[PDB]
Amino acid sequence: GSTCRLREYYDQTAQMCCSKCSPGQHAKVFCTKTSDTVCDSCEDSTYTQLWNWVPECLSCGSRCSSDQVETQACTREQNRICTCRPGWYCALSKQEGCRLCAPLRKCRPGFGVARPGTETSDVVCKPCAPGTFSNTTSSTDICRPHQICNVVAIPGNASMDAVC
Template sequence: MFSTLFVFEIVAVFTVRTLCCRVDEYITRDGQCCPMCHEGTVVRRDCTLQSGTRCVPCERGTFMNQANGLNKCFTCTSCDPAHGLSALQTCTAVNNTVCEVINGHFCKSLTDTGCSLAEKHTHCIPGQGIKEPGTSRNDTVCEDCQPGYFSPDGVNCTAWTICSETQVQVKEGSQTIDIVCGAPGALSASRHHYLLIPPFLLFFSLVCLMSKHKCLFCISA
């Protein structure tokens, strides 16, 4: 019974102290109500019976965007170009930095104060084309080239070349390379392969041949 009353008294005291502070006041560590500091400032010294709250401006690189009873300003967000971000709005004493994505990137995490996380646009691989170009809000969408089309650089799918009536197809096309056309003789020539024998190898072969068939070079007695 005693413990229940004790807990009730603590809750009651805390509630009374909370309710005694107005909307524009904050509670100090010793339970006193003091006027809040304005935006761009924080508390340096709590109020007393003789003086009000003493506030100090936020230092450079920090901000405070609300009335408060805090003793430390918030750190300004850094827009790092290495992570695909640049500053759209610089940080002030009352507002945080607003970041935006740089070209070639898209935002993966968008907040009320700008982009907090960016990523590079996807580069389509050879054999693919760009279905939807990347924007500041969305990544690039890639798609495979259809049969009869090719893309060597992963940008656009282009239709294979159609050989003319006076040409023949010398090389087949694929998703990454075009068809190669040429004169009818080019196809025949491409099918013939010639073996080039170095001079020293040819000489060595002749010597071996002569040693195996000495009778051809001997004079009968």
């Protein structure tokens, strides 16, 4: 046999189907041949996010580190999640959320933002295709087309705008 209801597992000690506990609580007293499972709600800063029969709830991670925002509170049914604030990306990802936050790289003079930065990937920097420039050190500013002119005084490089 060993085929049980949904929200039930087969407790081998009791040789019978037993009800699981719900997200938000842990198994307090296990299955017996006579009575069923005895569940209890999770207490201080603890949780369970699945139907379970674990003896105690998981530990909510510590509070969010500097330059981080908590985008999800530790509840009885979910762990605390911390995210990087705008301008920062996630250097080192965690099981869920971000462990370490870093400042978005800067695209120096001559280099233009290739692709923007998400919360999981930094910004990619690389020079401009012939005919464009960037005299700005930015993590957002992209290569702009050279000025346009009748009199091409000084030709434009990827680092300075053309002169007229």
